[PDB]
Design a protein around this ligand. Structure first.
Ligand SMILES: Nc1ncnc2c1ncn2[C@@H]1O[C@H](COP(=O)(O)OP(=O)(O)OP(=O)(O)O)[C@@H](O)[C@H]1O
Ligand SMILES: Nc1ncnc2c1ncn2[C@@H]1O[C@H](COP(=O)(O)OP(=O)(O)O)[C@@H](O)[C@H]1O
Ligand code: VO4
Ligand SMILES: [Mg+2]
Ligand SMILES: [Mg+2]
Lengths: 616, 575
């Protein structure tokens, strides 16, 4: 299904590339960890000096250590002598505070050095994390610009947006909150294990016994919690899909009386998401207490056995103090990792989704050749295309467009008129055949240059969040004010813009604004006109615009229609009258073609379509 | 600025305050148990080791074992109840946001947009829930550990607890200074994250327009600059965050060295025992490690604050369209439209878009509304649906004001195909069920046949179960129009509102659909917004609006002789 271990490996490899700066980060971390781990041994030596002085002060000065042990054995209870045997005290001396002070000064210097090294390592980690995050966002943007249209068509917009924006932010947050902890914990475990091996093998065995038991309990808990996490993400996706469908079509949901059904569906999906989230959170959070419990069991065992050994004289009190410090500093990294396991798990899931998006197949290898329309002649040669292979939509289609000719495309509602100009713009790849502009194949040229050469009025009008001026200048952002104003006036955008109190400054949007459907279409027309295209495609450009306004629009656009090989798709036959070439296509095939006079004389489909106005 | 965050927390954690109290009690018990284990170790050193009493060592080890069992029990209880409280808070906040958004009108919903509403119904709520969860789990440990460690130090050796009483405020002050310098950087980083997300959303929503105009280099440059700015802010935040661990550890270590020095000074005299050094070292290593743990996840606070600002912005929006006190409920509303002296002005506009509009649509008749682009036909259609409320006058459907009705029966009597429509993701049958929700396959096929949509649905191998994309973009524009028409038809409503529902149909398909609707909607009132004069001849009444007011009312023959605007339209459309 989904690869989380591989995604975690890929994320780690992106965060820690070849040994240029990651080597410096690792070395600084190792040095700081080792220097700060040495410290408890020094503190234990100071404690040993204090204990030795305090114990030896109370014994008579005339006796040696062996004589003191013998005297203690001659006394009662036997065990004080065994305790004294390992002390290495000098009776009647007391505490030498000079040695204590020197030892503590050494410890303080080492601690300062360790703090400085840790600070530098943290700064380098921040730099490298931000580098990988910038690279990740840039790669996501490039992938968005490289994907085929069927990828966006087959998915919901909100799901893709969350995979593109939310998942990257989640990766950033998880990495910035866990990477330094991870590195420090991994280094600290081995450094502390080394020092505990130095102090005493038996107690370090007792301490390292935790790792098998902790890993086993972690495996059990993670086996019980991974299905819960999968269910939580599935339910979250279902809830987000329902919310997106309800919000996007809120007018249809609201007006058609389906508001209560949407509310009930949301309630059930919200309850499912809550139950799955609670289960996943509880089981994921169970990891830290279990690790702490096993570490505390080992701590109790170490404390008891160490106290027994010190009372017997096998280990000194300062050594046991250092070992207790090391047991705490060994258990802390495991507990920290267990506590941040949930953040790591969320980040790894987000990385899995992002890498899934980044591994999607792209359109094709875009040719580096720049498009150059010398005259504007467009020709189709047996072009066949089909979405969802097995259902042909265009087959064995051919046409010739003269460099100045206005080609009109008319026909039934699902004939393939939009598909034809989408193939011309190379929005989709032709299954069989080829399309040539001025003798050069459009499949052997860069998509960017080809699409910039052709100025298209989309059938589905779209505007971005911004001013009317910005939307019109979207066609050619480098144009000056006079050109934008002229393009708006020619498309009669200026006529309704002057009415508004914020002419050219009023903000419009795809789903709203101070605009109407006809005015939105007019703005799209002006946007396409400002691009001064060499090839013009108007795919139902006046469907939402009244005939009185469209006549003036045609009068103004006669300048552009003269020498730019206009492709006109229109269900209003008056708008495509007197066109140089009229194509009538019915089921993806051009069943009849010619000018208005020849098509009328030939009768056929075009004559029937024109006679619909006259009735019968 | 975090005023809205606290209001949201206070409102939506109130049902779980008892769970929070239980979590706090269990957390303090577990933290004091973990702090008490070093105290028992100190007792082992002082009582057992210093006196050679191994039996006392074994007894205190048993005490330590019991303390560890209590600690693990309390930690498990704390994580369970914290998960319960956090997930309940998130569930309740999501429900509240969704319920408030579903009461919005068109204007209030458009003030935010569907994408923004979805994001702040899911991810903003998730961010605030994560804040609650991490506060319950890890953030409260640091104050509890600090206070409990101070009290444990007082219990162990009151003559050396001043070292903790000095070390804790010093680290607190240093961390407070770092946080004061770091929080505005985090807020700026969140602002830039919102900006880059807006750029990405704009790019994804208009990907077809981007590729049509070859705007790839411009979008790439815009994203590169936004990415660089966000990276600079994140680098500054990381610069400030990289000081928190070294300062905390330096305080730990300086406090440990001073502890050894001053404890040795006190142990040289008969004022302190050796095991208190072990106890205090563990107290430092626990208190400031808890502080270090709590300080690492501090990015979640400004993010939660801005997300709460957005959520409270949505939740503070007041709806303008409601059932007033007690809606009138006519039996089987199936009649006429009044529209008496209706005047409408869009909110935030300087001039009204409709002025003194007065015309009556008789029941069972077809009324055609004609006009220029931006005349106000869609506004009038939305006023009939009561998607917007008239500034002045009234609409008076069935002789009763649309404001006096509850908007469920008014919408059940109206089958609307809007100018800007929507087809949901799923199947054709599922989309058609929005019209009826209990329709059989036979009446589904009848509705498809009326809309001339039966051919391309039957042609699919899956028939009525042919998949439909999120907006129907796997269909042609006229196929989407015919699906919307079929959805309106399957409802069999009393009133048909065709807000330019035939602009994407060819002449033959338009004629077939219009004849089928004439056969079907003969008994139902029809209000049609059309541009072709040839199709308004069949209409019983034609309304012409220009500049936002009615310029002529009558039939086609009457209007071509008395209405200059209608005459101009007919002359323009003449063949
Ligand atoms: N939020 C808004 N939504 C729609 N129209 C608005 C809004 N704010 C102001 N208007 C104004 O409302 C007027 C009428 O808009 P409406 O959509 O009703 O026009 P129409 O004539 O029905 O449409 P079309 O352009 O398709 O013929 C426009 O001139 C527009 O400037
Ligand atoms: N992006 C798409 N994915 C799948 N099918 C599509 C897509 N775009 C168009 N079609 C299908 O192509 C068929 C005919 O092509 P189209 O250009 O839509 O016809 P026309 O321009 O005559 O309306 C329609 O039945 C439509 O459903
Ligand atoms: O369904 V259409 O012929 O308006 O592309
Ligand atoms: Mg089309
Ligand atoms: Mg309209």
């Amino acid at each position: 299904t989904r690869d989380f271990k591989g995604s975690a490996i890929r994320l780690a490899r992106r965060l820690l590339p070849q040994r240029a700066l990651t080597l410096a980060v690792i070395l600084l971390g190792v040095g700081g960890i080792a220097i700060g781990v040495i410290g408890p041994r020094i503190l234990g030596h100071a404690t040993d000096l204090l204990f030795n002085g305090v114990i030896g002060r109370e014994l008579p000065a005339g006796l040696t250590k062996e004589q003191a042990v013998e005297a203690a054995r001659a006394r009662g209870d036997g065990t004080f002598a065994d305790l004294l045997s390992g002390m290495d005290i000098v009776p009647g001396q007391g505490v030498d505070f000079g040695a204590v002070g020197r030892t503590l000064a050494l410890a303080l210097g080492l601690y300062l050095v360790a703090a400085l090294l840790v600070w530098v390592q943290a700064r380098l980690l921040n730099v490298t994390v931000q580098r990988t995050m910038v690279a990740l966002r840039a790669e996501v943007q490039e992938k968005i610009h490289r994907l085929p249209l069927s990828y966006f068509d087959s998915r919901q917009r909100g799901e893709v947006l969350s995979r593109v924006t939310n998942d990257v932010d989640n990766i950033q947050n998880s990495v910035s909150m866990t990477i330094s902890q991870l590195l420090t914990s991994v280094l600290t475990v081995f450094a502390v294990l080394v020092m505990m091996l130095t102090i005493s093998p038996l107690l370090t065995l007792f301490t390292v016994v935790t790792v098998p038991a902790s890993l086993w309990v972690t495996r059990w808990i993670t086996r019980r919690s991974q299905p819960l996490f999968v269910a939580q993400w599935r339910n979250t996706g279902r809830l987000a899909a329902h919310l997106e469908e309800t919000y996007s079509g809120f007018t249809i949901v609201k007006t058609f009386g389906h508001r209560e059904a949407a509310a009930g569906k949301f309630a059930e999906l919200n309850s499912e998401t809550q139950q799955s989230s609670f289960g996943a959170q509880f089981f994921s959070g169970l990891v830290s207490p279990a690790t702490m419990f096993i570490g505390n069991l080992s701590y109790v065992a170490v404390a008891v056995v160490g106290g027994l050994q010190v009372a017997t004289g096998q280990i000194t009190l300062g050594s046991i103090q250092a070992f207790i410090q090391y047991v705490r500093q060994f258990n802390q990294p495991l507990t920290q990792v267990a506590g941040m396991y949930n953040t790591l798990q969320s980040g790894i899931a987000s990385a899995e989704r992002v890498f899934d998006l980044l591994d999607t197949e792209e359109e094709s290898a875009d040719s580096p050749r720049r498009a150059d329309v010398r005259t504007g002649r467009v020709e189709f040669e047996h072009v066949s295309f089909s979405y969802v292979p097995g259902t042909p939509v265009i087959e064995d289609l051919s046409l010739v467009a003269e460099p100045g000719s206005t080609v009109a495309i008319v026909g039934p509602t699902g004939a393939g008129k939009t598909t034809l100009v989408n193939l011309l713009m190379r929005f989709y790849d032709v299954d069989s055949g080829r399309i040539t502009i001025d003798g050069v194949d459009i499949a052997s040229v860069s998509r960017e240059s080809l699409r910039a050469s052709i100025g298209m009025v989309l059938q589905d009008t779209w505007l971005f969040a911004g001013t009317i001026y910005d939307n019109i200048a979207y066609g050619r952002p480098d144009a000056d004010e006079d050109e934008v104003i002229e393009a708006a006036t020619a498309a009669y955008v200026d006529r309704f813009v002057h009415t508004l109190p914020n002419g050219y400054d009023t903000r419009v949007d795809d789903d709203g604004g101070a605009i109407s459907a006809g005015e939105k279409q007019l703005i799209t027309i002006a946007r396409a006109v400002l691009a001064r295209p060499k090839l013009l495609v108007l795919d139902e450009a006046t469907s939402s615009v009244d005939t009185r306004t469209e006549l003036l629009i045609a009068h103004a656009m006669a300048e552009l229609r003269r020498d730019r090989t206009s492709f006109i798709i229109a269900h209003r036959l008056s708008t495509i009258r007197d066109a140089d070439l009229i194509l009538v296509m019915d089921s993806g095939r051009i069943i009849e073609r010619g000018t208005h006079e020849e098509l009328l004389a030939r009768h056929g489909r075009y004559w029937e379509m024109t006679r619909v106005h006259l009735g019968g | 600025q975090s005023n809205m965050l606290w209001a949201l927390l206070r409102q939506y954690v109130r049902p779980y305050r008892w769970l929070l109290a239980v979590v706090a009690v269990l957390q303090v018990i577990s933290n004091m148990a973990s702090l008490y284990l070093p105290t028992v170790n100190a007792a082992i050193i002082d009582d057992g080791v210093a006196k050679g009493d191994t039996a006392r060592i074994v007894e205190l080890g048993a005490v330590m074992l019991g303390v560890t069992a209590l600690q693990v029990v309390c930690a498990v209880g704390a994580v369970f109840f914290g998960a319960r409280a956090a997930t309940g808070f998130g569930h309740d906040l999501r429900a509240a946001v969704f319920t408030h958004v579903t009461t919005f009108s068109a204007e209030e919903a458009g003030r935010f947009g569907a994408a923004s509403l979805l994001t702040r119904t899911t991810n903003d709520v998730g961010h605030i829930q994560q804040l609650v969860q991490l506060t319950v789990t890890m953030l409260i440990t640091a104050p509890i550990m600090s206070i409990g460690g101070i009290f444990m130090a007082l219990h162990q050796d009151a003559g050396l607890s001043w070292l903790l009483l000095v070390s804790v405020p010093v680290l607190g002050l240093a961390n407070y200074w770092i946080i004061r310098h770091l929080m505005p950087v985090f807020t700026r980083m969140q602002s830039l994250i919102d900006g880059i997300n807006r750029v990405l959303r704009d790019q994804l929503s208009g990907i077809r327009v981007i590729r049509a105009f070859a705007r790839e280099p411009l979008e790439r440059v815009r994203f590169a600059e936004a990415n660089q700015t966000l990276s600079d802010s994140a680098l500054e935040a990381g610069r400030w965050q990289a000081l928190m661990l070294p300062v905390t550890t330096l305080v730990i270590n300086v406090s440990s060295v001073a502890l050894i020095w001053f404890g040795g000074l006190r142990i040289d005299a008969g004022q302190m025992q050796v095991g208190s050094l072990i106890a205090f070292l563990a107290y430092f290593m626990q208190i400031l490690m808890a502080v270090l743990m709590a300080t690492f996840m501090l990015v979640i606070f400004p993010r939660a604050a801005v997300c709460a600002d957005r959520i409270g912005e949505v939740l503070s929006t007041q709806t303008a369209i409601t059932n007033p006190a007690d809606p009138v409920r006519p039996a089987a509303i199936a009649g006429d439209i009044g529209v008496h002296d209706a005047t409408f002005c869009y909110p935030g506009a300087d001039r009204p878009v409709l002025q003194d509009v007065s015309f009556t649509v008789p029941r069972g008749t077809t009324t055609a509304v004609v006009g220029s682009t931006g005349s106000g036909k869609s506004t009038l259609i939305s006023l009939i649906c009561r998607l917007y409320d008239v500034t002045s006058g009234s609409l008076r459907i069935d002789g009763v004001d649309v404001r006096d009705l509850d908007i469920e029966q008014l919408w059940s009597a109206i089958g609307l195909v809007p100018q800007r429509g929507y087809l949901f993701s799923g199947t054709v049958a599922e989309n058609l069920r929005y019209g009826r929700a209990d329709a059989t396959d036979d009446e589904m096929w009848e509705a498809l046949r009326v809309a001339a949509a039966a051919d391309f649905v039957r042609a699919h191998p899956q028939g009525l179960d042919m998949p439909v994309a999120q907006g129907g973009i796997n269909f042609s524009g006229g196929q989407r129009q015919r699906l919307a028409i079929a959805r309106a038809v399957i409802r069999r409503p009393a009133i048909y509102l065709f807000d330019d529902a035939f602009s994407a149909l060819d002449v033959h398909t338009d004629a077939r659909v219009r004849d089928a609707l004439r056969e079907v909607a003969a008994d139902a009132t029809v209000v049609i917004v059309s541009q072709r004069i040839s199709t308004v001849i069949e209409a019983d009444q034609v309304v012409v609006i220009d500049d936002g007011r009615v310029v002529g009312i009558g039939t086609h023959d009457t209007l071509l002789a008395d209405c200059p605007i209608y005459a101009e339209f007919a002359e323009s459309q003449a063949l």
